[PDB]
Amino acid sequence: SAPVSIWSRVVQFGTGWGFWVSGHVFITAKHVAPPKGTEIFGRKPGDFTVTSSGDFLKYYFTSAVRPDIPAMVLENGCQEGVVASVLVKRASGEMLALAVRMGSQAAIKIGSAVVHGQTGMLLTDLGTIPGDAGCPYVYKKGNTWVVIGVHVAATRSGNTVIAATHGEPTLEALEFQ
């Protein structure tokens, strides 16, 4: 479904994967990233800036690292009900697009961390596995592909997954009633 060229944007990173949103912007799961202050893609700290929000991590490079790729829209999650695709790469280079119905956005507790993200329900042993964190969630919005977050967590059994998103909630901020 997703354009063939989009997969070259998914690369190994730390103990997981990350995604080039543009030639300048690389997103990943905080928990898989190399330690802060590590040289990456041949660039030293200072040649890039890093922002984190929950388990979402974004690197911005002043000079393009991948000039061969057009910029894509990065959204803070998407509307509940959107059928998105997790672009999972495995170490072998195998590419597995996993259909997922996006659920609600919330601040989700995973172990000792709190992740701002969006829940999802895998539509199909053939889901995500340890090592997949950082792979992007994308969908075709109208007539263009947009990225909404990165894979961070799943249940062992069952089809629940969590994508970390870049923002903290306003309209989507949960409050006791």
Residue numbers in the entry: 0 to 123, 131 to 183
Paper passage:
To prevent autolysis of the protease in the high concentrations used for crystallisation trials MNV NS6pro was inactivated by mutation of the active site nucleophile to alanine (C139A). The active site triad of H30, D54, and C139 (A139 in our mutated protein) is located in the centre of the peptide-binding cleft formed at the interface of these two domains. Strikingly, in our structure the flexibility of the C-terminal polypeptide has actually allowed it to associate with the peptide-binding sites of a neighbouring molecule in the crystal – a happy accident that has revealed the structure of an MNV NS6pro-peptide complex. For chain A, the interaction is symmetric: it donates its C-terminus to a neighbouring A-chain that is related by crystallographic two-fold symmetry and binds the C-terminus received from this molecule. In contrast, chain B donates its C-terminus to a neighbouring B-chain but binds the C-terminus of a third molecule (also a B-chain). The adventitious insertion of the NS6pro C-terminus into the peptide-binding cleft of neighbouring proteases in our crystals has provided us with a detailed view of a structure that corresponds to the protease-product complex of MNV NS6pro that forms following cleavage of the NS6-NS7 junction in the viral polyprotein. The primary contacts with the protease are made by the carboxylate group of P1-Gln and side-chains of P1-Gln, P2-Phe and P4-Leu.
X-ray crystallographic analysis of the NS6 protease from three different strains of human norovirus has revealed the protein to be a cysteine protease with a chymotrypsin-like fold, similar to that of the 3C proteases from picornaviruses. The amino acids on the N-terminal side of the cleaved peptide bond (the P1 position in the nomenclature of Schechter and Berger) are typically glutamine or glutamic acid, while the P1′ amino acids on the C-terminal side is usually glycine or alanine; the residues at the P2 and P4 positions tend to be large and hydrophobic in nature.
